Amino acid sequence: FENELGAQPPLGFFDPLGLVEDGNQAKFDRLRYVELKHGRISMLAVVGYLIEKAGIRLPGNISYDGTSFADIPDGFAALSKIPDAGLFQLFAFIGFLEVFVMKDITGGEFVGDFRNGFIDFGWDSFDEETKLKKRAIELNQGRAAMMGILALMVHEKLGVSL
Amino acid sequence: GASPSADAWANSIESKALPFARAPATLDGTMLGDFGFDPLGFSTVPVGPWFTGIEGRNGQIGNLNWYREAELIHGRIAQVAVVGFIAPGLFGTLPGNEWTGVDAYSNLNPLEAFSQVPGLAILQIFLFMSYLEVRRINIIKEEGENYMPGDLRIGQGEGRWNPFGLDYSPEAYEEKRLQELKHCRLAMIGVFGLWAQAQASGVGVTEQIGAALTTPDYYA
Amino acid sequence: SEIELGVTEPLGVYDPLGWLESEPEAFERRRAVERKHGRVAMAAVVGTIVHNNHIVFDGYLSPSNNLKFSDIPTGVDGIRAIPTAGLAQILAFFALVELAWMPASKYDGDYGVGYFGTDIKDPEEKARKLNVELNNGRAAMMGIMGNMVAEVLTGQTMYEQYASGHIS
Amino acid sequence: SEIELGVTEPLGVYDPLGWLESEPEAFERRRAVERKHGRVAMAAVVGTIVHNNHIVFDGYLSPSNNLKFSDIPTGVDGIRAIPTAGLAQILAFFALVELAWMPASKYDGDYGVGYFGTDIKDPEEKARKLNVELNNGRAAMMGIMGNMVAEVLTGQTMYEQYASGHISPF
Amino acid sequence: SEIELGVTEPLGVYDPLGWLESEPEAFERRRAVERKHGRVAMAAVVGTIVHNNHIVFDGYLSPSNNLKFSDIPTGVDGIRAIPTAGLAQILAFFALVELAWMPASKYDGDYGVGYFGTDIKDPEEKARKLNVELNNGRAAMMGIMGNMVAEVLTGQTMYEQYASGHISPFGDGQGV
Amino acid sequence: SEIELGVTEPLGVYDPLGWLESEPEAFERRRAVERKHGRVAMAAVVGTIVHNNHIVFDGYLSPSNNLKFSDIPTGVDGIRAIPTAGLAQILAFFALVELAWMPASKYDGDYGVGYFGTDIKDPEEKARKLNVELNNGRAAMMGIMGNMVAEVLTGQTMYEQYASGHISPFGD
Amino acid sequence: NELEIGATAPLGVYDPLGWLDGEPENFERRRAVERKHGRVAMAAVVGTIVHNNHITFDGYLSPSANLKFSDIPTGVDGIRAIPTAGLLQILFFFALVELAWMPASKYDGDYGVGWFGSNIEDPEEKARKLNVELNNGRAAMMGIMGNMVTECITGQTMYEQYAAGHFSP
Amino acid sequence: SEIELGVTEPLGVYDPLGWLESEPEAFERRRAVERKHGRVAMAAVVGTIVHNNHIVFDGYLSPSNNLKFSDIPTGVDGIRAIPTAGLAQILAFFALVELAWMPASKYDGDYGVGYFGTDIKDPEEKARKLNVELNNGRAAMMGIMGNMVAEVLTGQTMYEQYASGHISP
Amino acid sequence: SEIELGATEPLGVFDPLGWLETEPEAFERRRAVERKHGRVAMAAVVGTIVHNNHIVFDGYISPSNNLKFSDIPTGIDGIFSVPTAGLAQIIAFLGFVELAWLPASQYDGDYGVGYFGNDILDPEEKARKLNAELNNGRAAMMGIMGNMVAEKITGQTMYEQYAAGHFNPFNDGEGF
Amino acid sequence: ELEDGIGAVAPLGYFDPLGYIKDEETFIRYRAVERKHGRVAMMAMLGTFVHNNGWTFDGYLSPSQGLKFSDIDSGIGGLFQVPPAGLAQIILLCGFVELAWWPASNLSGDYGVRLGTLNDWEEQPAKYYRQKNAELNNGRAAMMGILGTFTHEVITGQNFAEQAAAGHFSPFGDGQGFF
Amino acid sequence: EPLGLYDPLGWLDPEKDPASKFATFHANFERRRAVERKHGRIAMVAVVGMLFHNADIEFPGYLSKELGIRFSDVPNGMNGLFSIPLAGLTQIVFAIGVMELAIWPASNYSGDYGTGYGRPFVPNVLEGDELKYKLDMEINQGRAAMMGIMGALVG
Numbered sequence A: 001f002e003n004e005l006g007a008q009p010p011l012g013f014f015d016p017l018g019l020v021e022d023g024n025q026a027k028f029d030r031l032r033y034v035e036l037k038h039g040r041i042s043m044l045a046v047v048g049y050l051i052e053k054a055g056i057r058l059p060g061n062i063s064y065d066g067t068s069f070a071d072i073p074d075g076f077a078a079l080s081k082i083p084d085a086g087l088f089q090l091f092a093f094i095g096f097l098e099v100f101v102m103k104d105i106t107g108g109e110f111v112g113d114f115r116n117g118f119i120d121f122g123w124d125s126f127d128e129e130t131k132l133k134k135r136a137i138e139l140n141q142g143r144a145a146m147m148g149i150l151a152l153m154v155h156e157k158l159g160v161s162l
Numbered sequence B: 001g002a003s004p005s006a007d008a009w010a011n012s013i014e015s016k017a018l019p020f021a022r023a024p025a026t027l028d029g030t031m032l033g034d035f036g037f038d039p040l041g042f043s044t045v046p047v048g049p050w051f052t053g054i055e056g057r058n059g060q061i062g063n064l065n066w067y068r069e070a071e072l073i074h075g076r077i078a079q080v081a082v083v084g085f086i087a088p089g090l091f092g093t094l095p096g097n098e099w100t101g102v103d104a105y106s107n108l109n110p111l112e113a114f115s116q117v118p119g120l121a122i123l124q125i126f127l128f129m130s131y132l133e134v135r136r137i138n139i140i141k142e143e144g145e146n147y148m149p150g151d152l153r154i155g156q157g158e159g160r161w162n163p164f165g166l167d168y169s170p171e172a173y174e175e176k177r178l179q180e181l182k183h184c185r186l187a188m189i190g191v192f193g194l195w196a197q198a199q200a201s202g203v204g205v206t207e208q209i210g211a212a213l214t215t216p217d218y219y220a
Numbered sequence C: 001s002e003i004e005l006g007v008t009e010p011l012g013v014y015d016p017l018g019w020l021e022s023e024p025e026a027f028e029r030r031r032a033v034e035r036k037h038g039r040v041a042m043a044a045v046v047g048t049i050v051h052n053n054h055i056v057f058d059g060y061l062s063p064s065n066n067l068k069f070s071d072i073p074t075g076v077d078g079i080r081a082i083p084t085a086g087l088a089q090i091l092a093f094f095a096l097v098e099l100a101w102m103p104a105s106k107y108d109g110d111y112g113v114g115y116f117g118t119d120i121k122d123p124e125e126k127a128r129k130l131n132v133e134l135n136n137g138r139a140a141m142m143g144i145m146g147n148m149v150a151e152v153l154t155g156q157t158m159y160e161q162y163a164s165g166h167i168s
Numbered sequence D: 001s002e003i004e005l006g007v008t009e010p011l012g013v014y015d016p017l018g019w020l021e022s023e024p025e026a027f028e029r030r031r032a033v034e035r036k037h038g039r040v041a042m043a044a045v046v047g048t049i050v051h052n053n054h055i056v057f058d059g060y061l062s063p064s065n066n067l068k069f070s071d072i073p074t075g076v077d078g079i080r081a082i083p084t085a086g087l088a089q090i091l092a093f094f095a096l097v098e099l100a101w102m103p104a105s106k107y108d109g110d111y112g113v114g115y116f117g118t119d120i121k122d123p124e125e126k127a128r129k130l131n132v133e134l135n136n137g138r139a140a141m142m143g144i145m146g147n148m149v150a151e152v153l154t155g156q157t158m159y160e161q162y163a164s165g166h167i168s169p170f
Numbered sequence E: 001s002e003i004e005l006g007v008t009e010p011l012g013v014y015d016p017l018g019w020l021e022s023e024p025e026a027f028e029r030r031r032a033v034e035r036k037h038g039r040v041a042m043a044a045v046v047g048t049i050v051h052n053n054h055i056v057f058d059g060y061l062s063p064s065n066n067l068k069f070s071d072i073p074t075g076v077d078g079i080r081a082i083p084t085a086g087l088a089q090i091l092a093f094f095a096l097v098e099l100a101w102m103p104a105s106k107y108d109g110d111y112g113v114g115y116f117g118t119d120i121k122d123p124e125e126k127a128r129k130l131n132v133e134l135n136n137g138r139a140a141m142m143g144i145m146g147n148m149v150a151e152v153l154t155g156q157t158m159y160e161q162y163a164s165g166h167i168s169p170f171g172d173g174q175g176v
Numbered sequence F: 001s002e003i004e005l006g007v008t009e010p011l012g013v014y015d016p017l018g019w020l021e022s023e024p025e026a027f028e029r030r031r032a033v034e035r036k037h038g039r040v041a042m043a044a045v046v047g048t049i050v051h052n053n054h055i056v057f058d059g060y061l062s063p064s065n066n067l068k069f070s071d072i073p074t075g076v077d078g079i080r081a082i083p084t085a086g087l088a089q090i091l092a093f094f095a096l097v098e099l100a101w102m103p104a105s106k107y108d109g110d111y112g113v114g115y116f117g118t119d120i121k122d123p124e125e126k127a128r129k130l131n132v133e134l135n136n137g138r139a140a141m142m143g144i145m146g147n148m149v150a151e152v153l154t155g156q157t158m159y160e161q162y163a164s165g166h167i168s169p170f171g172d
Numbered sequence G: 001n002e003l004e005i006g007a008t009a010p011l012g013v014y015d016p017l018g019w020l021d022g023e024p025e026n027f028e029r030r031r032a033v034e035r036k037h038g039r040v041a042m043a044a045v046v047g048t049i050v051h052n053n054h055i056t057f058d059g060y061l062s063p064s065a066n067l068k069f070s071d072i073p074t075g076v077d078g079i080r081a082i083p084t085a086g087l088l089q090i091l092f093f094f095a096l097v098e099l100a101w102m103p104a105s106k107y108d109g110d111y112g113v114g115w116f117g118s119n120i121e122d123p124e125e126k127a128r129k130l131n132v133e134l135n136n137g138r139a140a141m142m143g144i145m146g147n148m149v150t151e152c153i154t155g156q157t158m159y160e161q162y163a164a165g166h167f168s169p
Numbered sequence H: 001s002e003i004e005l006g007v008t009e010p011l012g013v014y015d016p017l018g019w020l021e022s023e024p025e026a027f028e029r030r031r032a033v034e035r036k037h038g039r040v041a042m043a044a045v046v047g048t049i050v051h052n053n054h055i056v057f058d059g060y061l062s063p064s065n066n067l068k069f070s071d072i073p074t075g076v077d078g079i080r081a082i083p084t085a086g087l088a089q090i091l092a093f094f095a096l097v098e099l100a101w102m103p104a105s106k107y108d109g110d111y112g113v114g115y116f117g118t119d120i121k122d123p124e125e126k127a128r129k130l131n132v133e134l135n136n137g138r139a140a141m142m143g144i145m146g147n148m149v150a151e152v153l154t155g156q157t158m159y160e161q162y163a164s165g166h167i168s169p
Numbered sequence I: 001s002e003i004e005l006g007a008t009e010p011l012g013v014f015d016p017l018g019w020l021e022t023e024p025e026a027f028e029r030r031r032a033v034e035r036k037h038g039r040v041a042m043a044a045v046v047g048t049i050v051h052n053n054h055i056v057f058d059g060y061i062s063p064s065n066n067l068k069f070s071d072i073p074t075g076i077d078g079i080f081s082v083p084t085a086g087l088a089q090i091i092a093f094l095g096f097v098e099l100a101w102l103p104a105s106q107y108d109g110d111y112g113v114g115y116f117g118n119d120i121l122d123p124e125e126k127a128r129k130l131n132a133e134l135n136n137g138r139a140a141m142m143g144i145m146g147n148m149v150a151e152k153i154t155g156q157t158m159y160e161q162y163a164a165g166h167f168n169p170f171n172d173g174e175g176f
Numbered sequence J: 001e002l003e004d005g006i007g008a009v010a011p012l013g014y015f016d017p018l019g020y021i022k023d024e025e026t027f028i029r030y031r032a033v034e035r036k037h038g039r040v041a042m043m044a045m046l047g048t049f050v051h052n053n054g055w056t057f058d059g060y061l062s063p064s065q066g067l068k069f070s071d072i073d074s075g076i077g078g079l080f081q082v083p084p085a086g087l088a089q090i091i092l093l094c095g096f097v098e099l100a101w102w103p104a105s106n107l108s109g110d111y112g113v114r115l116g117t118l119n120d121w122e123e124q125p126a127k128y129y130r131q132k133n134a135e136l137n138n139g140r141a142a143m144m145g146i147l148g149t150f151t152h153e154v155i156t157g158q159n160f161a162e163q164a165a166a167g168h169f170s171p172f173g174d175g176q177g178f179f
Numbered sequence K: 001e002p003l004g005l006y007d008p009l010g011w012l013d014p015e016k017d018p019a020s021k022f023a024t025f026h027a028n029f030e031r032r033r034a035v036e037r038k039h040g041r042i043a044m045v046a047v048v049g050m051l052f053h054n055a056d057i058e059f060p061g062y063l064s065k066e067l068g069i070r071f072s073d074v075p076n077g078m079n080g081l082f083s084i085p086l087a088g089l090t091q092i093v094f095a096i097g098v099m100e101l102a103i104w105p106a107s108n109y110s111g112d113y114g115t116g117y118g119r120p121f122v123p124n125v126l127e128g129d130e131l132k133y134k135l136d137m138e139i140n141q142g143r144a145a146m147m148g149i150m151g152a153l154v155g
């Protein structure tokens, strides 16, 4: 596992702990799945904090009860003032995505390929190493976004401005 | 045509414990403690290790190794339980906190001392009694047909636990087996009388013997 | 086979559109829709009976919105009295039924549950019950559609249509 | 089969009229009447048990005629105390049953239902229950006839004959 | 060897029962019981001297029971005054010592230590101190039992018996 | 004779990681670290016993700070009460020890001192004491850790926890 | 070899009577007396130091005779202040020592013990310590005789002298 | 051997004047003097610690001169406070040591005493302890001379050199 | 066969630890532990619904302790509010069932009863209900540990939490 | 039957420990009795479970004698508080079953009672052996339970509802018997 | 053997040809002797029971302690068994039922249950002509007790 998506020019196959020192492809493909899974969430979460921390809101009335989007605070306090009928819909739809329409159903080219032959914005017009270059970009962009969103969550409860 | 146990009462050798009653043929004399005592004929209907599953529910013919397994485990508990019926009344009791409650371990009636001590006292006793019965099944499952009854791998012979040495002679070892079995059968009768007198008197046996081995206050 | 599964005596095949000769490849889904529309309409019309008989659940549907189970109307607008998180829980659970557990794209109509749990192995007895699931579904489709138009045209629910003398 | 169905133990093939040997082809018609008269009279005996146990439907049978369900007598005058628009609903729905649905011209007896939905696989077990329907149908034919005769020759219903202690005719 | 280790000058080989030739195989444990009993009774005599010289640890044995160290009797009712949760600690520690660390089934008493950590390499000198351990164990065995019967027959600890001048037998004494 | 020096009763050879079969070449350092961590923790569990028995040095540790030996806490915060001009004097002298006098680069653990100045010529008697130093060193590593963890889990030092009767695990 | 054990450096072998080259068969008892007189006198000079430094046993030696340990003299009359039931306990215990445990008939000297319980394992440093036991025995035999002579001449103990300053004759 | 007894790791054979080959026969005296000066200096360093902790003998050194043990200064002016009848006693007892008992003409160094009375049988352990005696003698020789010049250049004993905080250079 | 049971559609043969190709010898008991843990947790989940719906029997479970059936709590403390002589009677009978009647050393889970008494003679219908037992048993293992942990974290039983409307863990007073 | 081993169940096997089967013909007589006694003692055991739970009908068993259903004791004497004009109706109907409908002279015990899909013995012969053994085993356990229920009322004087309300489940320390 | 036709010296009228019309089991002579002997044996212990109850050998004690019925309260006439409680009359008929099926089974038509004549616990076996003589005297005294009860129960 020394020349793959994670092998980078600054640190090629870092691996300090005792994770994959064997020929276990099935253990690597599970761990590569979750790292791409944590990265794709934390990429939207870094933007999803800095949109709310900048005060940007949807144009108003998150409910018919008379609660605007600007009334909902930013950060960890957002989950407390979201109305609970809509808090179920956030968990039900994300669960609808994560159970049904997010998987490698038809069989993709790699780990994390969720194009089931349904949505495809190209992926044929590439140089076959630009495919591996674009895949290694979203791994490392997903890598920095995990440490990014962990910094914004540890320093909100601390109160330190960033 | 005939029963498998009616043919064992047809041979029906002479007995020693019931010398007027003609013990059945399934007491071959080859077992330890064979004194020809089976008036109800349980040895003619031998039992198998039913706890291992449905494949072990049926008993082999002429094999009383699981009746002897149940005889030894009843008698080994009954020996420890005679002392447990006695020793709180003789050597005092244990003290309690305000957590367990004071006078929790102090009930000298041994039967309602079960409901007086905390449940964690009995849960940990039961789980330690459980742990050696897990040890017994892992010995029975491993040895199978070559398992001698009462073996928890404690003592003299093969790779058993022997922290005391205990290297008996190979014929002094068979009188220790007979001393154990005769104390197994005796303490089973003794722990029944301890349990039945503790209900009939309501006190422990030292408060019952000690009140009967003393002179009355109007007589002194 | 599913081709003879819906034909009974007093109508037989009965295609005024003739859609078994024309486009016969679409019959395998139209049977799956008629079986699906039948099973929903049977459960909708035995539920209309128990709604208007007042067999309610004696509690609160939503105490945060102060909805007792008896507060919901027993007619056509009773589905609208269910709140936002109430209708979201129905859409979330039956997405797990219609796509995962008993997937509604499976055109067999056969999700391994049988008729009260048993495989009817007699093929003449099994073909009789599937004529019954279709015929009682067909009569409930006209039943549940003759109950909505009997409420939106008279205003009353079924309990009030019967406790008025307003049948004839 | 079919002809070996009314023969249980004691009387066997009992007929003191000779009509199994006089008309051998007019038997499937007569067995179908015997089975239909049995099924009617069996439901009528259980009906008189439920009526005279005062299990009523807790409402109004005809609110326009203003009679409750606990207003019809539990004896022979039960059908007589029913409005004729309600009898017209009974006679027309069972017209669909006796002609269009499970008919009476189907002399075989089995329409589609079997014994509690299924078919009895063992033929000796199946022929046993076929005698049971015949015997219990034959006993309830005499049973419901002696419930109506003992009512009209007393003037009391089955509930009133029992509660008043009037059972022995002597 | 172990059968030459108990014999000293005025008596030599001393067995009135004659079990050195009658039961020659039971000797190897019976030496280990005599050595164990001797070692236990030597610490019991020195402890009896220490308790009656009023050397106390200056504190509380059981502060829950309001039991100071100086409130404990310095005689044969010393550990009868220890609370039962304290005797449980003594039995649990010497279960670890008498079964695992220095196990009493080791019938030579040769666990890990020497004489003050020294292996005496001279065999005539090592047999001399092995004779001393047995003889001081035999003397303390008589010394602890005569101490114990002199207390229960006088009702006094060894401090009180030397306070009242009660060395003379009111019962009947036997001492060297 | 270092492979067999930690091997004692019931456990025998104990390596759940299997590092004696994975790294046979790094054992000489890893033994020298276990011996050093044992010697440091053995002088530390004895240290908490001395500190919680209020054996102090009867004077001023820092008269410039007006700090007595009895003013220092007897728990985990005792090293923090020492002023940094005195903490520099500790590190300056043990730099002379751990680099020059008894250098910790010497992976034997063996210096000019023996066991109370004595070299043990009997090899089974010497390996018995080497096993004791490792075993009492291992038991003091788990002892100095269970003394620092149970202090911060109660906030009291070992003197104040025992005085309050806080031995039984009530809150945990 | 007991024959060169007494001879030290500054005088060598010393026999003004010539009883080594006289009777040779009496030497092993005369060595056994010189060693025994040494060991008794060395424990006596140390005993005069402890008594005159007022180190006492903090109690009553004889509460029947009302004798505290502080009431015993520290000179030659200290042994005579002991009661006669106390001098017999010294007499009967040291009968068990002198006849049975460390029997004085053993003219070799080594009873059971060595130099703090051990043989010295070395014939030239054990002979050096055997020289020390005799020489420190010899200086203490004169030391206890000089302690008792000036006790009875001056009439004072060794604490009353050194409180008067009696250091010149 | 005696020629390898002074060497240690951080200096080795430290002869900056090259006198081990310039005077090879004079090594036996100079080793005996370096060991003799070290043995005096290590007793002198430990002595300065005991003097300046005010551990005193609790009495009178000279009742004729009315001089208690506490009346003697701890630092450099402590041997000057001893009377000349007492300095005659020191030079008389240590004339018996330095000439007769442990004679300083004996250049071997080992007298009848060993290291705490024991010979060291291991030649690699005996030579190690011989190196410690020389090195702790070397460290105390410059150590005691650094305590004398910390008083004759200050005018203040080692006790109140620490009380007044006057160790700042 | 046994090794294809428990592998249904959305995950297939799901073993992220890889112990099927690593330890195939231990599968035949690990299926039996999974099936037993499932069957235990299915009766445990059904029990918590019956307890928190206040379906109790009548009268006293222990008239000597004066302890009604309704006096037993409907949460974690319910089985421990039974007196110890009553708890010993349950465990003695459940050990009789789990050693003699339905012996849990029988690893295929086959105890003579079928599915409502019947053998499922169709092999693909039998494998469907064998998977439905495993899947409902695996779902009930999460359900009972999700009802036990969520009681001891929120501090209320399943009835008191639902009475209170304490369903949202984001706007209450808890951690985070 | 002997060959398929119907009474011999897996704890004890062919439990004939006193040697009573010396003939195959005397087994069919004894099994005809054991199965008949077990069928009677099972309904007797369900009786004492229903009677001692106080579950009675509403009304009068005998309005001629004024005997309500709740006036009948739930113990061993409740059958004989029934009037003998009513007890003759029980014996006449049960005797008509014993001679005509389920004739007890039929030593097989099979009277054609088949509850079809709950015993499909032709497809599932293992269910035949399970239900044949469980008729005997439940009949054997209820035979001893009804000797349990009968003698526990005799030696204590209280029925099962009364001796359980008192907690009287030990023959030691009470005033009854010499124990 | 006790089933011979030579006991009661003969002879009487009908021979009962109606017995073999349609109930042919009851037409067997060997059962009619077993019935005549058993009606005889029950009648003989019933006239002694008539003599004991009418001589007021009442009993010492209570019959039912719960109902408070002493033995002196039950009548001496023909309503004696029907005045004791039905829970007590059940125990009588139950113990006869063990006798009627298990101990002295009435299906054994000989009547010989191996008891001898006069000696309990060991049977007094009669051997020859007096064995056959005591058999007919059992029948002849059984017949006089059968006609004696109907003479003593009509009034």
Ligand SMILES: CC(=O)O[C@H]1CC(C)(C)C(=C=C/C(C)=C/C=C/C(C)=C/C=C/C=C(C)/C=C/C=C(\C)C(=O)C[C@@]23O[C@]2(C)C[C@@H](O)CC3(C)C)[C@](C)(O)C1
Residues within 6 Å of the ligand: E049, E052, E053, E158, E159, E162, G113, G115, G116, G117, G118
């Ligand atoms: C390094 C080296 O060289 O090795 C060393 C070590 C080694 C090996 C160990 C060796 C040894 C042998 C040794 C050390 C032997 C020592 C033996 C010892 C210490 C024996 C004590 C007896 C005291 C008794 C019996 C008390 C009686 C009882 C008494 C006194 C009383 O009851 C009265 C009293 O109590 C009360 C009642 C009230 C109090 O108010 C007053 C008193 C106190 C009066 C060597 C050879 O010597 C040298």
